[PDB]
A paper describes a structure:
Human manganese superoxide dismutase (MnSOD) is a mitochondrial matrix metalloenzyme that catalyzes the dismutation of reactive superoxide radicals, generated as byproducts of mitochondrial respiration, into molecular oxygen (O2) and hydrogen peroxide (H2O2). As the only known mitochondrial enzyme capable of converting reactive radicals into diffusible products that can be further metabolized or exported, MnSOD serves as the critical first line of defence against oxidative stress. In the wild-type enzyme, Gln143 mediates proton transfers with the manganese-bound solvent (WAT1) to drive redox cycling of the metal, which is necessary for effective superoxide dismutation. Substitution with Asn stalls catalysis because the increased distance from WAT1 disrupts critical proton-coupled electron-transfer (PCET) events, and the redox cycling of the active-site metal is impaired.
Substituting Gln143 with Asn preserves the active-site architecture, but the hole created disrupts proton transfers with the WAT1 solvent. The alternate Tyr34 conformation and the presence of the Wcav solvent introduce new hydrogen bonds within the active site of Gln143Asn MnSOD, which are not observed in the wild-type enzyme. We note that the resting-state electrostatic solvent-accessible surface of Gln143Asn MnSOD is different from the surface of resting-state wild-type MnSOD. The active-site funnel of the wild type is much more positively charged than that of the Gln143Asn mutant. This is because the wild-type resting state contains Mn3+ and the Gln143Asn resting state contains Mn2+. Gln143Asn MnSOD retains the more neutral surface most of the time, and this seems to help stabilize the H2O2-binding sites. To monitor changes in the oxidation state and coordination geometry of the catalytic manganese in the Gln143Asn variant upon H2O2 treatment, we compared the Mn K-edge high-energy-resonance fluorescence-detected X-ray absorption near-edge spectra (HERFD-XANES) of the purified enzyme before and after H2O2 treatment, following established protocols. We observe no detectable shift in either rising-edge or pre-edge features, indicating no alteration in the redox state or coordination geometry of the catalytic manganese after H2O2 treatment in Gln143Asn MnSOD.
Author numbering:
A (entry chain A): 0 to 197
B (entry chain B): 0 to 198
The structure:
């Protein structure tokens, strides 16, 4: 009945040298912890305002709900999208879909990189599934706005481009972080999410 | 719970010739009614989502909640802000505050007119009360975003500048609508809302 912080499925240092253990520990144990806690606080406030029919209070809570709820949604997916066992290319129908919809795996990587580099301020780049069209789709989201809740696309792979996702290690050079992160993408998890859509 | 469409404080033609009866009837019986109906549907969907801990669903419902919920909030205030016995100027402490914060009643009208005419697309112009600062403040809101829920200001007087608020009568000439509406402002209601902000 309450949202909880999922354990990281690997050690804080498991993604070194691509994302260092200081980032992983802060990102999970400080940043995500705060979203979950503030999400639960906001949800309780929203339950009270709903039961009273206080629409002003409901609307005033929307920023916190989207930001912290989106934070919890996005980071929960993000941790499973990475793995010490990741890197390389997907296989099977996910790879065939990537080649069909984006031309090639490398072309897909440069489109998702571009979407991720192009976020001005805080946000996320996403590979999603468009269930209406039955094909893959790339989108960028601001701050912690979550993909499915704001666009209807089913999330397959997210890349956090908030500065806390990379700054300690890569400083201002966001492209260096994006170069590195391809080495730890958990294509097994992205594949499972894709198959679940179809 | 279940929100309801409030009765109008007067009949649909009571604000003529400034806002014609066809507009008032559509505005209350069709537009506000739809906000209530869609607000109730959206609240029930949010109750289901909360019980499931479905945060995606909660967030997907926010546009409909803000739009219809804000529509309900704003129009409920709007109807009480107008009156067949309105027009003229406020008195007492509200008039004192208007002179103090905007210089004069006429300069206040200019500023609220300008904010309302300046909305690009659908929206509202508002005179509000800033509780933190203890003075009056003019703001504009897009679409049906409600004043207090999005800015913290307490609404005193709102002017709907959605096209459905004036188009049938004034067509594209929103400034003529703004000039006419001053004739039906219920300063008694605005005063009540102001006094409530500070006792
Ligand atoms: K590196
Ligand atoms: K006339
Ligand atoms: K009058
Ligand atoms: Mn993050
Ligand atoms: Mn309206």
């Amino acid at each position: 009945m309450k949202h909880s912080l999922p354990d990281l499925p690997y050690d804080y240092g498991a993604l070194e040298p691509h994302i260092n253990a200081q980032i992983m520990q802060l990102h999970h144990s400080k940043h995500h912890a705060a979203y979950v806690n503030n999400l639960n606080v906001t949800e309780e406030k929203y339950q009270e305002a709903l039961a009273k029919g206080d629409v002003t209070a409901q609307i005033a809570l929307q920023p916190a709900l989207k930001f912290n709820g989106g934070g919890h949604i996005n980071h929960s997916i993000f941790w499973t999208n990475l793995s010490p066992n990741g890197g390389g290319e997907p296989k099977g129908e996910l790879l065939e879909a990537i080649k069909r919809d984006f031309g090639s795996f490398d072309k897909f990587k440069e489109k998702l990189t571009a979407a991720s580099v192009g976020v001005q301020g805080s946000g996320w780049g996403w590979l999603g599934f468009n269930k209406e069209r039955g094909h893959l789709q790339i989108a960028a989201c601001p701050n912690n706005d979550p993909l499915q809740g704001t666009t209807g696309l089913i999330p397959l792979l997210g890349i956090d481009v908030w500065e806390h996702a990379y700054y300690l290690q890569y400083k201002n050079v966001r492209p260096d972080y994006l170069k590195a992160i391809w080495n730890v993408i958990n294509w097994e998890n992205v594949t499972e999410r894709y198959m679940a859509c179809k």
